[PDB]
Amino acid sequence: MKMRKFTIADASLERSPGQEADISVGNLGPITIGYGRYAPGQSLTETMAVDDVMIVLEGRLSVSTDGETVTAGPGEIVYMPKGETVTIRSHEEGALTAYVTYPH
Amino acid sequence: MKMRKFTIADASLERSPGQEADISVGNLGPITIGYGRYAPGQSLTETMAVDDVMIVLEGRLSVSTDGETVTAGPGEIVYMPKGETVTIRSHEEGALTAYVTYPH
């Protein structure tokens, strides 16, 4: 309804130490905006609950599904569709991301 | 349906010299992914045809609607809803963006 600005500070990531955070900052549905943070050398595998358009801001991720792996560095986007099982691996400098999720 | 990666190179921006490009790189609807490029010191005003979630990658934009202005630098997101009239102003180093649009 109204213009809105978001920044990574809205994710208060210092409150959630650990190997990985993905925290929503807005619901625009719901179409949700968030930011993520991956510690160096972290791998996890998840079946996507929702369609996710992720952009790497800093560092680097590899994303794998089926028989196919891509790597995403700063400015690069990976679309991860609902129901696909993906492995996300952060590299030696970790990663920061932004993302948008949406429903069917 | 399948995982996909996009990068700013997919927008072939060298083909579109000028003061501003916003070029789609994928349709995921349609939910569309794109990248933008603004020359230094460029202002334009548009009524949004679609809801647009924009992230600044490099440089800086100011975005104004109604009585309110925000500025977005690298990593910062501006949501611009359908039907709102927005003025986008790029600063002295121009700007690069990524964005996602979607319909009602």
CA distance B87 to B43: 7
Q: Give exposure, A4-17, as e/b (b: 16+ Cβ within 10 Å).
A: bbbebebbebeeee
Q: Please, which residues bridge with residue B89 across strands?
A: B43, B62
Q: Is A63 on the interface with B (CB under 8 A)?
A: yes
- Phi and psi, residue A46, nearest 5°: -145, 140
Contact A6 B79 (CB under 8 A): yes
Resolution (A): 1.4
The DSSP result for B47-74, as a single string, is E-SSEEEEEEEEEEEEEEETTEEEEE-T
Residue of A nearest to B32 (CA): A53
The answer for residues whose C-beta is within 8 angstroms of residue B20's C-beta and 6 or more apart is: B36, B37, B38, B39, B42, B44, B90
CB distance A3–B77 less than 8 Å?
A: no
Contacts of A37 (CB under 8 A, 6+ apart): A11, A13, A20, A21, A94, A95, A96, A97
Question: Which DSSP string corresponds to A23-35?
Answer: EEEEE----EEEE
DSSP tag of B13: G
Domain A2-104 sits in which CATH superfamily? Jelly Rolls (2.60.120.10)
What number of residues does chain A have? 104
- Judge: B77–A2 Cβ closer than 8 Å, yes or no: no
Distance CA A63, CA A56 (A): 11
Which SS3 state, helix, strand or coil, does residue A47 take? Answer: strand
Q: Do A72 and A90 contact (CB within 8 A), yes or no? A: no
CB contact under 8 A, B5 and A100: no
At B86 the three-state DSSP class reads: strand
Under DSSP, the state recorded for B98 is E
Name the DSSP letter for residue B90.
E
Q: Where does A28-84 show beta strands of DSSP type E?
A: 32-38, 43-47, 51-65, 68-72, 77-80
For chains A and B, count residue pairs whose Cβ atoms are closer than 8 Å. Answer: 105
CB atoms closer than 10 angstroms to residue A53: 23
| Three-state SS at A8 | helix
CA distance B56 to chain A (A): 9
CA angle B29, B96, B62 (to 5 degrees): 95
Tokens 């319909």 — which residue? Answer: B103
Q: Which of A8, A19, A28 is nearest to A101 (CA)?
A: A28
Coil, strand or helix: which one is B14? helix
Q: Is A92 touching B (CB cutoff 8 A)? A: no
d(CA B43, CA A93): 37
Breaks in chain A (C to N over 2.5 Å), named by the residue before each, are 28
Q: Which residues contact A22 (CB under 8 A, 6 or more apart)?
A: A34, A35, A36, A97, A99
Instruction: Return the residue of A nearest to B35 by Cα.
Output: A75
Instruction: Tell me the residue type at B77.
Output: I
Flag whether residue B13 sits within 8 Å of chain A, measured between CB atoms. no
Experimental method: X-ray
Give the residue from A100, A6, A89, A11 showing the smallest Cα distance to A50: A100
